Amino acid sequence: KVFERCELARTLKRLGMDGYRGISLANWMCLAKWESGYNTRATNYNAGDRSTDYGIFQINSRYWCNDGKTPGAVNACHLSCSALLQDNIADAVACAKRVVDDPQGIRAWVAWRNHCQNRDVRQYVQGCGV
Amino acid sequence: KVFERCELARTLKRLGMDGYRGISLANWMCLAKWESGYNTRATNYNAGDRSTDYGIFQINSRYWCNDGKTPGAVNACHLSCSALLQDNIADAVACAKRVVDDPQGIRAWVAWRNHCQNRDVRQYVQGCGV
């Protein structure tokens, strides 16, 4: 499923993301845009370390979810990576929350550091009524 | 099912968890948060002793439930582990109560010792009307 911008904004808001760990809804939106283009089925296999990023937030199988095929992996979200490839994003949202509860917060995502951090992101939520 | 925070709090209170063996509702909430993110379908395989943790409270197959795949296991809750992956959490609540009946109580969960014990956990029930 590819979310439309405002559709995603309302969904994330409904799922308790707006201000979670001091992270605005617009920031979560910017993260989803740059990671997956709002695509819940997105996957990115890294031949380098044989890990894969899953779903709308591109969560990595080396540390966060289990795909049963990543060397030296842990499963900190206690969840199958397939749960992060579903149209219903509740599991993905729960796991993203777990990620930012770690010390480095949303900076865990290099794409967010590069394309969102310190920048204007107001346009992600503009006109969504959230 | 992935519970919303306040929905889970009210559900646990309804199932008689608040004050069970001296354990506050907020402590059960913190446990669930750091085990599964309130996800009834969470699982975690432990290569160490070939056991798996099941469900919202991440209850282990070596001692507490039967998954038919864990060597030398016992089934103290008298439940198949599949019952602990269901939307209805009555069985999971009954099993968590049984776990904390043992001498170490809630300290059985290492995630709880690391993320909850001795810390302020009022945030977990704030605004829930419980």
Author numbering:
A (entry chain A), B (entry chain B): 1 to 130
Article, verbatim:
Among other functionally enhanced enzymes, the Arg101→Asp and Arg115→His double mutant was found to lyse bacteria effectively at alginate, mucin and DNA concentrations that inactivated wild type hLYS. Iterative model building and refinement to 2.04 Å resolution yielded a unit cell containing 2050 atoms in two protein chains and 237 water molecules, which was in excellent agreement with experimental diffraction data. The Arg101→Asp and Arg115→His mutations result in minimal perturbation of the global enzyme structure, as demonstrated by a superposition of the double mutant model onto the crystal structure of wild type hLYS. The mutated residues are situated at opposite ends of the substrate-binding groove, and as a result they have little impact on the catalytic core of the active site. The mutant Asp101 side chain forms an electrostatic N-O bridge with Arg21, and is within hydrogen bonding distance of Tyr20. Even more striking, repulsive charge-charge interactions cause the wild type Arg101 and neighboring Arg21 side chains to orient away from each other. At the second mutation site, the His115 side chain lies alongside Trp34 in a parallel displaced π-stacking interaction. The corresponding values of the double mutant are 8.9 and +4.9, respectively. Consistent with the net charge shift, the overall strength of the double mutant's potential field is substantially decreased relative to wild type hLYS. At the same time, the two mutations manifest an expanded negative potential field in and around the substrate binding cleft (compare Fig. 3c and 3d).
